[PDB]
Design a protein around this nucleic acid. Structure first.
Ligand SMILES: Nc1ncnc2c1ncn2[C@@H]1O[C@H](COP(=O)(O)OP(=O)(O)NP(=O)(O)O)[C@@H](O)[C@H]1O
Ligand SMILES: Nc1ncnc2c1ncn2[C@@H]1O[C@H](COP(=O)(O)OP(=O)(O)NP(=O)(O)O)[C@@H](O)[C@H]1O
Ligand SMILES: Nc1ncnc2c1ncn2[C@@H]1O[C@H](COP(=O)(O)OP(=O)(O)NP(=O)(O)O)[C@@H](O)[C@H]1O
Ligand SMILES: [Ca+2]
Ligand SMILES: [Ca+2]
Ligand SMILES: [Ca+2]
Lengths: 309, 309, 309
DNA sequence: TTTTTTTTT
DNA sequence: AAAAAAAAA
């Protein structure tokens, strides 16, 4: 899986450790970089980069899979449950495995309570043979109270010390620190192959809407957000992990609410779960922009223990 | 149809297998390449390429067809239906057969639901004697859930295993991998003559808007998109297949929405179908830039089963 | 903690006093500024700012803390009590230490009486080993009667002259004077390290709702309020101090009351305490938007001596 | 050719 | 039941 199949196929050793300096560590990682962004890396020409692409092209089929073959090749995908069976039948078993899942709400709709539940119920063996693994959590506002994890872990009856161990944690401080933090994500997914299951970014747009002005720096903002969302799509298919992201809302005095991000974020997201408030601690959850499931509604219970019924 | 009529017309055998190395496999394929791009191929001079163009020019008429002759010669064209009779009377029978058809929407307007329907209703014998054939699908975002094909195939009452067999599938990963994937398309159209009917690119501009910067690399981007769209126009007339492409949108703070691509994509496209959202699961479809049909509107129903009424 | 670790790591002396001119005085302060807002400062290029970010990156771990490590690293946080044990069991021990706490009421609900109590009960050694320290108070309406502090200090039996000494005071006059007053806050937190515990802004939105018009200058107002609230989040984690803010209310003729600020203020606030009036001098306090504590209610007594039972 | 922001009473 | 303004690559 890692880059040593090219040594027996016409590539010497003096560039394998030079390609590993930028972040490329997988054979499919060479399939995902352009030939123009392999020259501006630190010390390679145009004459010797052509013989790397023909070296990698013999290892994977450059052909056309039949749709019957892709049906079995779409059995890598797991479905990570939420904590309530009314929210998983809505989503269709849980969260997808090679995709980006969005969720947005007003202000008290339970976004990080949905995030804090997933830090517990992804370490548990669910349906379909999903084994469970460790969890990357990139917090961005402040909200990673870890004693709330010890409050949800008791209703699933798991040990306290062995549920606070599989959650790796790192806080971003600005918009570019959120982008340079994805390099250590791709390394930790790669050096320990097969024991990571999801990646949670607590809010993508909580730092872009503050580090940029209004109409002046709008075009640089969406051209920097698109470079980040495409990198997350490649990470979620390199190592087959789920991605769950949340974002906030804004008003509309031109005509009520709508999520921020624009058309860049709405297109690059696979599923979007709207969230609003009901009576007491019930919450209503709709479905926006799903490839498979239709638009229905469900109900929550944000109790001590995350999401319930 | 293939290149062996030149052997009896002054061309030896030592270049026929040398022209087949680049991709030229048809007599009309020599009519579509320049005399300047036949020298930079791998091993031919200027003195021996002149005697190939005079060898091919005696086989097809270098004259002027009367418009009465071209009327019968425009009876190769079929029309592939959508799934609703309100959307085919708008388009004028369905999708054109020697052309490029575009469709763009906001984010939930049902673009890949329109694409997933065409993977089923092109294997069915429709009106005008259209027999039905296999389907090339080039996905670019992630969205080729094949179990949705088993959900539309039941409302047309066809067998499940014989509808998952005629869909060949390949995913592009970068912008140049999307261009080098068209070589295997032209070979698979050629080696099995007459059993392919359409080609679907899921999004052209979902990879160009991310692999290029703003005003810096704008001119290289549109000069690489124009090389791809012209290649698709030649493929759609070599083997007489339909081309259906989709693309996304952007805002306009200078003055609402407009499709990306610029003037290169709007000129090289034959028909453009705008798509917006109505109440519930109704959608409204307009017509932009059609050579034949006027500007009208229709209505959809994106149910389990693709497009309905 | 201050910026002298870079002198032994490839940074000369000619920019350390030039970075101190804008406000950057801590090693983590370089972790919180962008690379784009380090060029427009007064005299630095793009070629010499790259070697500052690599100089600071070796000092702190650019890695991933385990959640067991972050549990001990969340023991910096203290909890500043209010004055009644019914309001601290509701909040969960008191006010948070790395967060922004909001409180809103109708007009007589006791917002500045809640603020005037905190100027006294933060100089007292409470539970959990909280030592007590000095207090920054940014008043914005007019309401900092200091003889009310001598009325609450007697029920805690502390000396009068040594409770009027630890309260530094400054009044803002317009919206931008409220923003330029935070520069002297960050300097006074830095030059006397470890003897400041909270920062009180008396009202954020008492000056934004008057210096701006209706729908005309709405977008500039929320784009200037978001620049201020993010700066307060960084201050509250640079030096580990609490932030307590209050704001007012408005009606709703479209359909009763709701707090001003919009979705910018509701998202950037960590905890919100609603306040209403009961019979006599009892007041009722609810909880809006808390990461840890559920929605319950309590009771007050605004007597001579601040908040009681 | 590119790119959406923001509730008041 | 009514009210709009914002630009740089
Ligand atoms: N232990 C708990 N038991 C019950 N409800 C709780 C508990 N902790 C928090 N809540 C509720 O959960 C809600 C807060 O959810 P939260 O995860 O903060 O959503 P949020 O949208 O991220 N808030 P914000 O990030 O500011 O927009 C509030 O209604 C709290 O009252
Ligand atoms: N089985 C189904 N029944 C009914 N509606 C469905 C079904 N599956 C998906 N939908 C709806 O179809 C819409 C999604 O259409 P889609 O094909 O994703 O358009 P799209 O523009 O390609 N989305 P995107 O590519 O991100 O822009 C959503 O409104 C879904 O709720
Ligand atoms: N010495 C005192 N003893 C008891 N109650 C007092 C005393 N001084 C003031 N109050 C009460 O405190 C209340 C005013 O508290 P205050 O914190 O000023 O509310 P407020 O919300 O700030 N008013 P405003 O700023 O205009 O919204 C009134 O009900 C007064 O009667
Ligand atoms: Ca939150
Ligand atoms: Ca799609
Ligand atoms: Ca007051």
């Amino acid at each position: 899986q890692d880059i040593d199949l090219l040594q027996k196929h016409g590539i010497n050793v003096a560039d394998i450790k030079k390609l590993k300096s930028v972040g490329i560590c997988t054979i499919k990682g060479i399939q995902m970089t352009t030939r123009r962004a392999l020259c501006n890396v630190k010390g390679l020409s145009e004459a010797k980069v052509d013989k790397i692409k023909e070296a990698a092209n013999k290892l994977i089929e450059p052909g056309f899979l039949t749709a019957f073959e892709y049906s079995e090749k779409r059995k890598m995908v797991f479905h990570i449950t939420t904590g309530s069976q009314e929210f998983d039948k809505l989503l269709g078993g849980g969260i997808e495995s090679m995709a980006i899942t969005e969720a947005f709400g007003e202000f008290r709709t339970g976004k990080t309570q949905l995030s804090h539940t997933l830090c517990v119920t992804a370490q548990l063996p669910g349906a379909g043979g999903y084994p469970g693994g460790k969890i990357i959590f990139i917090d961005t506002e402040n909200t990673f109270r870890p004693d709330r994890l010890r409050d949800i872990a008791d209703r699933f009856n798991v040990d306290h010390d062995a549920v606070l161990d599989n959650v790796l944690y790192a806080r971003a401080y600005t918009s570019e620190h959120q982008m340079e933090l994805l390099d250590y994500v791709a390394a930790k997914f790669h050096e320990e192959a097969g024991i990571f299951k999801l990646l949670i970014i607590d809010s993508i747009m909580a730092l872009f809407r503050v580090d940029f002005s209004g109409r002046g720096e709008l075009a640089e903002r969406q051209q920097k957000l698109a470079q980040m969302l495409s990198r997350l799509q490649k990470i979620s298919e390199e190592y087959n992990v789920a991605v769950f992201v949340t974002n906030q809302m804004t008003a509309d005095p031109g005509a009520p609410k709508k999520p921020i991000g624009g058309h860049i974020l709405a297109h690059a997201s696979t599923t979007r779960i709207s969230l609003r408030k009901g009576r007491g601690e019930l919450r209503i959850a709709k479905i926006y922009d799903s490839p498979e499931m239709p638009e229905n509604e469900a109900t929550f219970a944000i109790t001590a223990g995350g999401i319930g019924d």
